[PDB]
Paper text:
PLpro cleaves the viral polyprotein at three sites, while Mpro is responsible for cleaving the polyprotein at eleven distinct sites, including its own N- and C-termini. Mpro self-processing is called maturation, and it is crucial for enzyme dimerization and activity. Here we use C145S Mpro to study the structure and dynamics of N-terminal cleavage in solution.
In this structure, we glimpse the in-solution state of Mpro, bound to two unfolded nsp5 protomers during N-terminal processing. The final model showed all 306 residues from C145S Mpro visible for both chains, plus clear evidence of an at least 11 residues long peptide occupying both active sites. However, the cryo-EM structure of Mpro C145S revealed a dimeric particle of Mpro anchored to the nsp4-nsp5 region in the moment that precedes cleavage, with detailed density of P and P‘ key residues. The electric potential map around the active site Ser145* indicates a non-covalent interaction of the nsp4/nps5 peptide (residues SAVLQ of nsp4 and residues 1-6 of nsp5 Mpro, SGFRKM), forming an extended β-sheet maintained mostly by hydrogen bonds at Thr24, Gly143, Ser145*, His163, Glu166 and Gln189. Additionally, OG atom of Ser145* forms a hydrogen bond with main chain hydroxyl group of Gln0. By carefully inspecting low pass filtered particles used for final reconstruction, we noticed an elongated satellite particle anchored around each one of the dimer active sites regions, with size and shape consistent with a partially folded monomer of Mpro.
Author numbering:
A (entry chain B), B (entry chain A): 1 to 306
C (entry chain C), D (entry chain D): -4 to 6
Write the structure that this text describes.
Amino acid sequence: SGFRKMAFPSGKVEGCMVQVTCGTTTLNGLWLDDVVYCPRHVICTSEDMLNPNYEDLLIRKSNHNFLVQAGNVQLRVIGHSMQNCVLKLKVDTANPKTPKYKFVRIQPGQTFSVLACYNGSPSGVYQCAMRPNFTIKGSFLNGSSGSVGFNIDYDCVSFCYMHHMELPTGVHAGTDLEGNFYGPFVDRQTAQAAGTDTTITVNVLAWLYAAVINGDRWFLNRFTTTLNDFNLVAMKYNYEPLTQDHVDILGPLSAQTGIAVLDMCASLKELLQNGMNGRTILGSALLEDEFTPFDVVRQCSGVTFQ
Amino acid sequence: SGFRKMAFPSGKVEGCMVQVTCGTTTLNGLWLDDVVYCPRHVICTSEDMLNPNYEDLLIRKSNHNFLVQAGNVQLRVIGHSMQNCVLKLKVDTANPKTPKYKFVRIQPGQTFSVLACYNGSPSGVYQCAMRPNFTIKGSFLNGSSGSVGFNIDYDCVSFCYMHHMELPTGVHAGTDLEGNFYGPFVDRQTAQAAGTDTTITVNVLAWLYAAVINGDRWFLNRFTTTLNDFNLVAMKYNYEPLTQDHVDILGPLSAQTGIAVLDMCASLKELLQNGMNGRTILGSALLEDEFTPFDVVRQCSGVTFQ
Amino acid sequence: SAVLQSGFRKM
Amino acid sequence: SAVLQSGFRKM
């Protein structure tokens, strides 16, 4: 049994990151084969933090200005290039620990295990959910840029994130390994605020599925409501609307637990209307919403490895 | 900023575990140097579940009956022995990835990152807190025995747990690598129930420190109460009593945030008496209590690596 | 009763 | 204001 914030193993990602330094500005970089993917903040002094000119700054920097350290190993930068909003530093050494990697741009709501790092030493790993406003509620400090988020399935790693900045409201922002940001953010110290945060409904449904399977079934009731009424109530309660695709992806959980999707949709609607009533579901008094159905399946009674 | 359930990196522990099999009963084991520490559940058929005779069972099993698999690598069992409630299988191959390991028996309330595993493949890693009733609220299923919990400091790993059983109330139990249980349990399918669960006060205070430093300071107030009154209120609210040592270990956080210990003790007492009043502290509507002050220091503004 | 775990491996 | 991050290493 048991159910809590469980993150993927990190060794395959622990052994594939280095420290990238330019002058007095350093950060973490994701090392794959003979390439190092790093945020382009590396070529930025403190005085030009407001409106960096990344083209001019990159065309000013040289090959030897980039310093790559894999623990205590020194790496030479054979070449450097920029794509979108990241830098690929072609290095002379191929990483022996690089696993089967994919660069996927995950849609909002899909969770992933970020590897919080500082100066090339993995500080830790924890789950995060890509919010609909295209931010992550991670725990990062100065020097944590380049802390990649990833998924692991069938012993294959898919990197889907690279941390870049904190928003003033406390949430964090990042790119994919291709370079494009997640959202309308810009790579400069300009006043940027994410949109209104909306709680993900499908993740809540997966969390309720996990609660039912674990042994907590007080919220279940015989009452059943249609999809459209549930969508209206979620909209007036600031939750993401539920589509047919979300019900379709919940099919394995419905088969595993034996409760139909609409039944727990009605139960969830009633939970919103009457509140949580003061009691507790699996150690949380608020609806946890960073649990995808795939994560529930691979973490609950299913015995999926990685 | 940011603050959530952050667990230690696992690669140094991912690369040091194998699968131990006897007949039709398999499970996970911790491989260190030329030794494999496994639960003695491995020598257990389904029929003798009530009162296993581990001495007779071990004296009946032979060396070749134990099968050790490191992924796709087959390991020969040179010898086997029992200590307390674990088996050390001396194998012919020394693990090249074994790090500096220590076997520490953590006191209740000290958190640790369990590496949930299934059939030798690391399924994931997540934080857990050793409850005062000497249980952990982990997420484990069948075949997860041997999933070691560990801490990492100064790139040195200290194993402090090994999962063995689930209690009927839903919490899990385990040993240390020395073999002694954490609590009054017995290693058999006998009806065993843990005592009344008590929330750890020092961990709550550390969580409040993290909330204050992160930027949430609504609960703070000028009211201040003595230690004895706070202890009485915690006792009548089913929390662990607070001693002088707990205030002493909280010193670094007091210096970092500038808030006196008794001030937040009074604030916490008032929170207990008046409830949480429906608002939220860092995504949780209940007092999180699996955050040690050391974990807060190494996770918050402190830039400690591993 | 305890649900003390180990894997149920075939063969 | 954005808190665009990197390391604050000296030398």
